[PDB]
């Protein structure tokens, strides 16, 4: 525990889980929504997925 | 004054009727119908192993 010739500095990143609160006025975004669909994919020799 | 000149179109027409239509896919959804026959279309797989009666096999083809 001799001190070499030269110093450190250390430097790490800490995490922190938080719960939030979100505001949004009234009207402030318009949407178009277009119609959903269904498709087959992927028929394997058991099954089909969809 | 009608010069048979190659084959019929109209013949033609109907033989091409048969090859044209595709598998189906990409049906769309209405939750005001939440189901419809057509989607039972795209959906079923109509398999084999009919039951050896006489049209039996010809129902399952």
Same mark, same amino acid.
């Given at each position: 525990? *001799?001190? #070499?010739?030269?110093?450190? @500095?250390?430097?790490? @990143?800490?995490?922190?889980?938080?719960?939030? *609160?979100?505001?949004?006025?009234?009207?402030? @975004?318009?949407?178009?929504?277009?119609? #959903?669909?269904?498709?087959?994919?992927?028929?394997?020799?058991?099954?089909?997925?969809? | 004054?009608?010069?048979?000149?190659?084959?019929?179109?109209? =013949?033609?027409?109907?033989?091409?009727?048969?090859?044209?239509?595709?598998?189906?896919?990409?049906?769309?959804?209405?939750?005001?119908?939440?189901?419809?026959?057509?989607? =039972?279309?795209?959906?079923?797989?109509?398999?084999?192993?009919?039951?050896?009666?006489?049209?039996?096999?010809?129902?399952?083809?």
């Amino acid at each position: 525990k *001799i001190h #070499p010739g030269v110093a450190m @500095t250390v430097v790490r @990143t800490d995490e922190i889980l938080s719960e939030n *609160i979100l505001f949004s006025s009234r009207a402030s @975004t318009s949407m178009f929504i277009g119609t #959903p669909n269904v498709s087959r994919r992927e028929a394997r020799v058991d099954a089909v997925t969809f | 004054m009608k010069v048979q000149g190659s084959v019929d179109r109209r =013949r033609l027409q109907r033989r091409i009727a048969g090859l044209l239509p595709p598998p189906a896919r990409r049906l769309n959804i209405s939750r005001g119908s939440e189901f419809t026959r057509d989607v =039972r279309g795209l959906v079923e797989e109509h398999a084999q192993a009919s039951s050896l009666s006489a049209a039996a096999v010809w129902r399952a083809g």
